[PDB]
Amino acid sequence: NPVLRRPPILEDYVHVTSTEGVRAYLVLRALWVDEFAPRHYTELLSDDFTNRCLLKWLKLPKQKVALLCGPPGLGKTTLAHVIARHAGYSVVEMNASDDRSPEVFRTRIEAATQMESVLGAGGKPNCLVIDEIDGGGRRRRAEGGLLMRPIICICNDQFAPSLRQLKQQAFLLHFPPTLPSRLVQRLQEVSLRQGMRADPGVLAALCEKTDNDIRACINTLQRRGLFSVWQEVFQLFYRVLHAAASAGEHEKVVQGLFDNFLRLRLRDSSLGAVCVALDWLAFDDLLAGAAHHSQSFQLLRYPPFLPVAFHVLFASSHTPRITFPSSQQEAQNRMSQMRNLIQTLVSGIAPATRSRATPQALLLDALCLLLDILAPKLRPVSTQLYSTREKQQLASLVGTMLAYSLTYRQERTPDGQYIYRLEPNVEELCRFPELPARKPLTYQTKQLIAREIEVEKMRRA
Amino acid sequence: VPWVEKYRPFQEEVVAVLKKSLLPNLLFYGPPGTGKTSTILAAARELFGPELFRLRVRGIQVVREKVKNFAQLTVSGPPFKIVILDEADSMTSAAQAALRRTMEKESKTTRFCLICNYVSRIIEPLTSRCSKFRFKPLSDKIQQQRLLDIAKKENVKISDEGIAYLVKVSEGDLRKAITFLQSATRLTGGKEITEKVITDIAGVIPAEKIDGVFAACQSGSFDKLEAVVKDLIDEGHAATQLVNQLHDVVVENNLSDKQKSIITEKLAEVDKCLADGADEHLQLISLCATVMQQLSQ
Amino acid sequence: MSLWVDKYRPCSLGRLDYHKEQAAQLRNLVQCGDFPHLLVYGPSGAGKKTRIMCILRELYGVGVEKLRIEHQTITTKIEISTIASNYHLEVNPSDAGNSDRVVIQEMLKTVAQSQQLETNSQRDFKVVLLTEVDKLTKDAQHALRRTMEKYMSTCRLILCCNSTSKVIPPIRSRCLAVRVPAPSIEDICHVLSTVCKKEGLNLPSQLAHRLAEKSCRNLRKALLMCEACRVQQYPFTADQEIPETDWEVYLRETANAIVSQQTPQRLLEVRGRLYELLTHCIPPEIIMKGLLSELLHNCDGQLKGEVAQMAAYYEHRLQLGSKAIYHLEAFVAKFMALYKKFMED
Amino acid sequence: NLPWVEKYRPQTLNDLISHQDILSTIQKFINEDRLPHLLLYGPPGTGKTSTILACAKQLYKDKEFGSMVLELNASDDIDIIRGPILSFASTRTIFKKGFKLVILDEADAMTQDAQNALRRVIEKFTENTRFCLICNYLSKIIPALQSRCTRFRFGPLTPELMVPRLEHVVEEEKVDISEDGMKALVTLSSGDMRRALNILQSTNMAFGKVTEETVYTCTGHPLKSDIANILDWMLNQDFTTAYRNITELKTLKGLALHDILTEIHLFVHRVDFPSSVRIHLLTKMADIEYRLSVGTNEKIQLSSLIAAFQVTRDLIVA
Amino acid sequence: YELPWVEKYRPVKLNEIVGNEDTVSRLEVFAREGNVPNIIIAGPPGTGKTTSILCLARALLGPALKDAMLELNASNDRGIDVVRNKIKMFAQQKVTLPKGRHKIIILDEADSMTDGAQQALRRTMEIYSKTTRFALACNASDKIIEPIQSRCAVLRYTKLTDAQILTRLMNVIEKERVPYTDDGLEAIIFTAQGDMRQALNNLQSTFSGFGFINSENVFKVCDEPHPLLVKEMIQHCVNANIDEAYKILAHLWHLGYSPEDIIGNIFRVCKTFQMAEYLKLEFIKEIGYTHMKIAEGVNSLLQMAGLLARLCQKTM
Numbered sequence A: 001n002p003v004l005r006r007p008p009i010l011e012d013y014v015h016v017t018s019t020e021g022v023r024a025y026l027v028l029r030a031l032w033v034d035e036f037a038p039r040h041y042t043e044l045l046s047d048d049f050t051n052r053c054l055l056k057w058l059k060l061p062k063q064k065v066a067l068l069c070g071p072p073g074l075g076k077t078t079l080a081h082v083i084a085r086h087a088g089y090s091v092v093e094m095n096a097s098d099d100r101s102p103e104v105f106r107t108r109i110e111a112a113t114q115m116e117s118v119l120g121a122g123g124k125p126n127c128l129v130i131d132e133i134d135g136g137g138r139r140r141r142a143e144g145g146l147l148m149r150p151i152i153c154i155c156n157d158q159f160a161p162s163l164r165q166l167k168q169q170a171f172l173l174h175f176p177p178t179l180p181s182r183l184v185q186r187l188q189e190v191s192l193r194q195g196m197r198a199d200p201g202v203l204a205a206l207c208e209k210t211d212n213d214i215r216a217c218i219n220t221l222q223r224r225g226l227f228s229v230w231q232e233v234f235q236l237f238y239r240v241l242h243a244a245a246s247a248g249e250h251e252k253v254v255q256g257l258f259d260n261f262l263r264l265r266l267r268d269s270s271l272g273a274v275c276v277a278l279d280w281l282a283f284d285d286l287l288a289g290a291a292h293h294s295q296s297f298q299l300l301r302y303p304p305f306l307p308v309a310f311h312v313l314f315a316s317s318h319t320p321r322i323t324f325p326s327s328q329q330e331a332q333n334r335m336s337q338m339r340n341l342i343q344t345l346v347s348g349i350a351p352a353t354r355s356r357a358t359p360q361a362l363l364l365d366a367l368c369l370l371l372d373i374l375a376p377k378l379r380p381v382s383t384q385l386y387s388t389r390e391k392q393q394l395a396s397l398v399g400t401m402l403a404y405s406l407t408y409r410q411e412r413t414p415d416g417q418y419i420y421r422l423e424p425n426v427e428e429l430c431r432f433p434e435l436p437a438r439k440p441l442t443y444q445t446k447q448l449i450a451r452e453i454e455v456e457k458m459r460r461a
Numbered sequence B: 001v002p003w004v005e006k007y008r009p010f011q012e013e014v015v016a017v018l019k020k021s022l023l024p025n026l027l028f029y030g031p032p033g034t035g036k037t038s039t040i041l042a043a044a045r046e047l048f049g050p051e052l053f054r055l056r057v058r059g060i061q062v063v064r065e066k067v068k069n070f071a072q073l074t075v076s077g078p079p080f081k082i083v084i085l086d087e088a089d090s091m092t093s094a095a096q097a098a099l100r101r102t103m104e105k106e107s108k109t110t111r112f113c114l115i116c117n118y119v120s121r122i123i124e125p126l127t128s129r130c131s132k133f134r135f136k137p138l139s140d141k142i143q144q145q146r147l148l149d150i151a152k153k154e155n156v157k158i159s160d161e162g163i164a165y166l167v168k169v170s171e172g173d174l175r176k177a178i179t180f181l182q183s184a185t186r187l188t189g190g191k192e193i194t195e196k197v198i199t200d201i202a203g204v205i206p207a208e209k210i211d212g213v214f215a216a217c218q219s220g221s222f223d224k225l226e227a228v229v230k231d232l233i234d235e236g237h238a239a240t241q242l243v244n245q246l247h248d249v250v251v252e253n254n255l256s257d258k259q260k261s262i263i264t265e266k267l268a269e270v271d272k273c274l275a276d277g278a279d280e281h282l283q284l285i286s287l288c289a290t291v292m293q294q295l296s297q
Numbered sequence C: 001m002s003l004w005v006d007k008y009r010p011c012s013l014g015r016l017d018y019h020k021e022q023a024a025q026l027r028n029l030v031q032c033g034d035f036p037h038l039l040v041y042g043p044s045g046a047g048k049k050t051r052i053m054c055i056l057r058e059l060y061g062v063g064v065e066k067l068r069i070e071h072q073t074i075t076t077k078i079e080i081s082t083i084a085s086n087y088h089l090e091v092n093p094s095d096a097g098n099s100d101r102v103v104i105q106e107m108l109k110t111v112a113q114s115q116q117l118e119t120n121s122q123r124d125f126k127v128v129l130l131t132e133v134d135k136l137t138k139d140a141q142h143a144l145r146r147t148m149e150k151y152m153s154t155c156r157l158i159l160c161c162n163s164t165s166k167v168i169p170p171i172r173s174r175c176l177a178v179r180v181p182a183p184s185i186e187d188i189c190h191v192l193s194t195v196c197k198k199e200g201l202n203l204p205s206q207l208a209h210r211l212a213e214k215s216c217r218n219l220r221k222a223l224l225m226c227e228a229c230r231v232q233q234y235p236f237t238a239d240q241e242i243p244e245t246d247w248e249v250y251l252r253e254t255a256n257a258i259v260s261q262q263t264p265q266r267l268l269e270v271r272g273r274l275y276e277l278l279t280h281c282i283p284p285e286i287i288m289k290g291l292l293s294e295l296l297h298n299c300d301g302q303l304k305g306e307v308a309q310m311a312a313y314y315e316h317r318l319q320l321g322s323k324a325i326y327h328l329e330a331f332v333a334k335f336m337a338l339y340k341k342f343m344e345d
Numbered sequence D: 001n002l003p004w005v006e007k008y009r010p011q012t013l014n015d016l017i018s019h020q021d022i023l024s025t026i027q028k029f030i031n032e033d034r035l036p037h038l039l040l041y042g043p044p045g046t047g048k049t050s051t052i053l054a055c056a057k058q059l060y061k062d063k064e065f066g067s068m069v070l071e072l073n074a075s076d077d078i079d080i081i082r083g084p085i086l087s088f089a090s091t092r093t094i095f096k097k098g099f100k101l102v103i104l105d106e107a108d109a110m111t112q113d114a115q116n117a118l119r120r121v122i123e124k125f126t127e128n129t130r131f132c133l134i135c136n137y138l139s140k141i142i143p144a145l146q147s148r149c150t151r152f153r154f155g156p157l158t159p160e161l162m163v164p165r166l167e168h169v170v171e172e173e174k175v176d177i178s179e180d181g182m183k184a185l186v187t188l189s190s191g192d193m194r195r196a197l198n199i200l201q202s203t204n205m206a207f208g209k210v211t212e213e214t215v216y217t218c219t220g221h222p223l224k225s226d227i228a229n230i231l232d233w234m235l236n237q238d239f240t241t242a243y244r245n246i247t248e249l250k251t252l253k254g255l256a257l258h259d260i261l262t263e264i265h266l267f268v269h270r271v272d273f274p275s276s277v278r279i280h281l282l283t284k285m286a287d288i289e290y291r292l293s294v295g296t297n298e299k300i301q302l303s304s305l306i307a308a309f310q311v312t313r314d315l316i317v318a
Numbered sequence E: 001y002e003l004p005w006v007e008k009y010r011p012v013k014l015n016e017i018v019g020n021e022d023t024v025s026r027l028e029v030f031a032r033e034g035n036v037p038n039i040i041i042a043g044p045p046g047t048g049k050t051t052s053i054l055c056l057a058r059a060l061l062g063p064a065l066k067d068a069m070l071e072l073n074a075s076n077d078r079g080i081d082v083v084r085n086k087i088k089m090f091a092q093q094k095v096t097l098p099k100g101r102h103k104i105i106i107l108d109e110a111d112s113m114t115d116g117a118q119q120a121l122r123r124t125m126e127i128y129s130k131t132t133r134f135a136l137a138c139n140a141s142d143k144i145i146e147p148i149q150s151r152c153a154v155l156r157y158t159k160l161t162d163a164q165i166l167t168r169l170m171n172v173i174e175k176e177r178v179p180y181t182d183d184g185l186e187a188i189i190f191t192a193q194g195d196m197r198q199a200l201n202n203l204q205s206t207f208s209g210f211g212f213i214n215s216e217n218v219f220k221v222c223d224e225p226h227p228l229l230v231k232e233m234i235q236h237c238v239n240a241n242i243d244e245a246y247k248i249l250a251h252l253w254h255l256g257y258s259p260e261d262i263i264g265n266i267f268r269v270c271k272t273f274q275m276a277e278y279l280k281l282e283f284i285k286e287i288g289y290t291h292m293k294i295a296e297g298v299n300s301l302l303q304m305a306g307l308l309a310r311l312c313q314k315t316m
């Protein structure tokens, strides 16, 4: 041992003494698709709720602007063109491929909107399209108040922080995917025109390989390789093979590992293993943060070892029922829509001369507000004294709902049963699942609350 | 008008070494009221004269542009004009590196007298490219005398022990004790300054709270720890202040060296976690859990 | 105009129900000249915003309550909404994201340049109340201190936050620390009883104490729960079923699920619950705090220290990192490992 | 007057010291017309810029130097690559033949996009223009850019060769230096001539003479005796007395816990701890330094250093 | 003057690219068939991305390459006003080409392009697909926005394995008559780090300096903390021998290597070291945390000694 009881005879030293003074001494040292575009209204495909429900609004009930949502490839670009063709209307298109300065964004659309056609009077009507939106936006908001010809802005989320206040005057539709019962027939006709042969089963397989994308299907008469990585890591040097096999995008690999490592069945007593795996996931997160805060390319050589770490720990004899990662992205977009909805509610409330509370403070303390809104459900019949003293009751309650701009609207479910929903729908902002559910308000009571809200609006104005 | 500049007046030897240049870059650091800016301005007036003035200083782009427009300019005719850059301590590391670059490519005809609170300088200006000069703070007795004089000429009713406590809670500098005295006499209407008002102005936790924290830790029951930490957070006391006072108490009483060591390791890591933005309540609960484990031995 | 939480917010410093000594000190501060920059802090529901509004009421006129919405844009462009009055501007620059520096600079620049239009009859400055200063970035806070020291003579700043831990020391130096503690249980009982009296009601002391304890000394929670239990049952009862938010109940049930079984299946179920909590926009540190508070109720005394230390450790790593689910999930996994080993042995 | 760093900045190629391998290789490249793109990297103040400037000055005469050597600094402003650098590399000479030269000092300060653009520029015009990249961290240079050039590592300057240059400085300038003063100057330099000359400036100016106490007080670096006292108090005195002694010494001499910790780390390997004790001390001290770097209170971090040693006291004694 | 061996032995045909066999064969299929789609080329630097794209364009276009191909680098202007003014105008341009040929726009090093520039690129790519094709190139594929990857056949390049680098080094040595030893080849391969450009540059630099190719000369020319010293220090950390590991680390420090270089070589050696794989992962995570501290700015000898101590105590 290096510790000495007596000082060294001829060596430099320092002494260490204990809490008792014992002391010791240590030494110191020193093409096909556009060929088969919809020619007439009869070339459209069945089972489609998009093209069958927009011609109702497009005739000349008072909606001004249009918008888009839902999955891509559903013919949202060609529905407007073919509807214009069938009803006798013209088409316009715009992009971010050209210079969309805020000023030029005005004139690039004004010509499309407020002038007629220098042609025969039949072709005068026009249809307008704006694409790839996700100065000019504020101008769109200014123009959207009053307009003559509805326009389409290509997006896929009506709950946007900006386009939500535009869809309230817009007749946005349902966007169901095109079912392939007639995609196969269309492809058979295309192949006959192009001199190609394929059995219905082969054609159906080629159609379903690309999620029944009509564009890709027509281009087919001529995916994702991350499952390989997940299979190599989750079932059986090996680790050098997984290090080399992780050649690809890394964030989605990590998402798949995070989503799938708890669905394996190596052991029910592998809490130590999942703790190490979560340690490695946290290490990856910290690396992602640090390689950006202190920009360092050399610091991103470690993240490739996350799949290797999920090997060794979780590699087993098969049973790799691996699903695609969705939890992180689904949580991201759900939290984004919750943030948009809280922004909507707070814009309804916070600057209204009163309601002095932080939006975060309000969010954590709004369920009790809904519980005040509950009110006794005694089904008031009389025009006075609504089952209670009105002032300490429904009157003050409708006052506080008008404060938050909370109202009850009418909706009709596809089953046909009448339903009322709160106007900005703060319940699912506030309520949670799988805990004791409280009884809701009756239909007629919500109707009475809406009527009281309207008369309160009339009284305040 | 604040009492700071109202009364702003040892280190003339640095003025002598600056005048004896017939000159490097300068780095003046110390507590804020130690007269570093006054020292460099006096050295300026002595070394050039009243008719020649200097440059005193948004980010770093404007700093670099201003220094370029100022240094790349013919002088009256002494060879080296300077630029000050007070409050350099608040500069970020990238801003400090850009400033170091600006000191070069201009060192042929200009100098820089950085004024800072010490260790915040990155290694490039701190080591080489600067001549460091530390400005020691006034001793405690002189500080108490100066506070007494300020209280006299401002008719502030504060006791001598009140002045001592004011210096204690602002240890190592004026311009913080003075501001605390001004804020206290504003809050109390000047009529009377007690211990509690100074304690609240300074943000200090009362010693009764710290004694209760140690009593709860000694009690050995986690429920009492939760209650005392919850009360301390509810009172609004900063967790960094609790860490400082807890460390001051622990390091001086009669705990075992092992107990002191464990509690001080915990205090240091809690201070680091609080510096990183960790939750005050959780950090304090964990700290008090470690303290309870040590005291309830 | 109807909510109990807002119907009885005191209008002036002289009618505050608690921290009366601090209210008197604040009236003394506003009574003299050279009103300084205030850093009002304290836990949510302590009354910071109420005290700030009262401070304005004796500082400016009654027209400080005539609050009107405003919107402005910033040059980076990001649009931000504000709340202003004839004498003060109230803005939360945090919601502008990482562009909070430019928005704070622009707002204070504009208000200081606009106060000069013969607006000096009552006071010689315009108050710029910043809310949630602790949510600002370091660069934003440095811009804030620069603008504070630059336009001190024309505009005054009031900073409101729940904790001064995230406020940079330079800002704490230039401002006057106004600590507003959370009201005591007795103060909450007193204000609840006064609200009930002014409402023509009667509140048993047992129910007042129960509401005060359940509110965790948050006064807006106390008033909200009092009114909710009033509309649930007009005659109060000492054992009334006081309601509480479903995110607190969900957090408690999540901790119960963590306790009830320690397996990776339960880990994935708890991870789903953690998503449910997170996406509902409750802060991850609040999740960790409530989770630990309920988990300690289900722990032996020899386990509570380690559980609390793990909670602090993983909340710290959560603050360092960017994906809250990773560290929340790692904390839950570590706790189940510890609890499973302890209950097993 | 003009600082000695600028005044004694080398001009001829023979002034440079300890880089005889690098100098010989670069001069051989110059003579044989095989000069590649150069990447000179190392600690600050070891003579990379002076080396390349001397080579450029022997390549081009004074009147041809200003039109054939473009000197730029990456810290001054991507527009550099696409403007001056691209224009200079893409054009021929004015009044000479042969290649032009670009000296990009502080090349590590470029962004990765700028380094990619520079790689494209270097690749396109490699025949007419040679680039010399000067940087401190080779790790900051993207592997694509550093694969276009031959890397020369300018190491730290050893005392046995650093001493003669400072001897020339103290002979030419009227400086009175002691042997311990020279040794301390070398030690605080740690292979940095700019640092050594700046310390000599500050000491010989403020105190008039250069000696160990004088240089250490001027730079603020803790003495060997002070660090030995701190270690002795931590290992022997109890926690409260050790804390008082170290706090008093630190506030008296204005010592930084960074420097105290850096020197105690060295003493930890000097003195003969047990292996486990040394591992514990190294882990704890690395933690303390990391916690210092973020802006914590130095009182508490100092108490944690004292704690790290007080824990090992009893373990060592037994 | 002679061309550097990186340019002297630059592949001019897709047949002489020793890179990823699947992607190379796919590119040859594109060159043979003709109707190449829009392609994204991601991978490590020095793997053959730009060489492959230029060879593909040259094979496709023949003599029409000069007026049918628009090659943009990191040294060119590629802002929003280029993808909209230069790229669009070139796409609209009329070039007469054979039946299966298209105008090829090579946005080389496109990861440097901003989000706005690629958004401008999006349906400029989509519209003129009838007449022009876009061949992107980047090191990081996540730097290319979602629509571009959606409308491109993302080809992936991977680091050249040791054998591929060895074969190309043999070819270059034989064609240059360069003396060598197997240890020198192993040293060149180690310093290459999977880059053919780096391997060729290191070989040429060692030939220029010393002529002979052996490990001593290679590490004299390609100066880095020696893999043998770093390897034995890692071995000392495995045996929980802190003193010997610190002897090696302090020797490296006195030689003047920066902590960034030392930790980079520590990670490189520990990546392919002989350990239990769990212990290797523990070491990798600890080295990653220390490297995060180093990059954050906390770069001192004490940090590296603390890393050594943590590695030693990972093995208890």
Ligand SMILES: Nc1ncnc2c1ncn2[C@@H]1O[C@H](COP(=O)(O)OP(=O)(O)OP(=O)(O)O)[C@@H](O)[C@H]1O
Binding pocket: A033, A034, A036, A037, A038, A043, A044, A045, A046, A048, A051, A071, A072, A073, A074, A075, A076, A077, A078, A079, A154, A178, A214, A215
């Ligand atoms: N109902 C339909 N009937 C016939 N053809 C259709 C129908 N819907 C889509 N198609 C065809 O599918 C192909 C792909 O559609 P397209 O590219 O226009 O998609 P999109 O949904 O408009 O796109 P996005 O949502 O991305 O803007 C086109 O050839 C189009 O004619």
Ligand SMILES: Nc1ncnc2c1ncn2[C@@H]1O[C@H](COP(=O)(O)OP(=O)(O)OP(=O)(O)O)[C@@H](O)[C@H]1O
Binding pocket: D004, D005, D006, D008, D009, D010, D015, D016, D017, D018, D043, D044, D045, D046, D047, D048, D049, D050, D051, D134, D135, D136, D154, D165, D193, D194, D197
């Ligand atoms: N070998 C040397 N001989 C003499 N002086 C030297 C030598 N190396 C460095 N110096 C001194 O270093 C100072 C400037 O350093 P220089 O720029 O030449 O080196 P460097 O290592 O490239 O620096 P940096 O990378 O920090 O810019 C001058 O004072 C010069 O005298």
Ligand SMILES: Nc1ncnc2c1ncn2[C@@H]1O[C@H](COP(=O)(O)OP(=O)(O)OP(=O)(O)O)[C@@H](O)[C@H]1O
Binding pocket: D144, E005, E006, E007, E009, E010, E011, E016, E017, E018, E019, E044, E045, E046, E047, E048, E049, E050, E051, E052, E109, E137, E138, E168, E196, E197, E200
């Ligand atoms: N597969 C390979 N076979 C032979 N040499 C190769 C190979 N890959 C790369 N090289 C060498 O690297 C040089 C350039 O490689 P590459 O095609 O990546 O060009 P680059 O412009 O350096 O690429 P980038 O900047 O996009 O990383 C080639 O000229 C050749 O010397």
Ligand SMILES: Nc1ncnc2c1ncn2[C@@H]1O[C@H](COP(=O)(O)OP(=O)(O)O)[C@@H](O)[C@H]1O
Binding pocket: A356, A357, A358, A361, C005, C006, C008, C009, C010, C015, C016, C017, C018, C043, C044, C045, C046, C047, C048, C049, C050, C191, C219, C220, C223
């Ligand atoms: N004296 C008082 N009487 C009644 N309520 C009070 C009193 N003081 C504070 N409060 C309550 O405190 C709450 C506000 O405190 P705080 O959370 O700091 O700010 P915010 O208004 O942003 O929520 C209000 O709901 C108010 O009812």
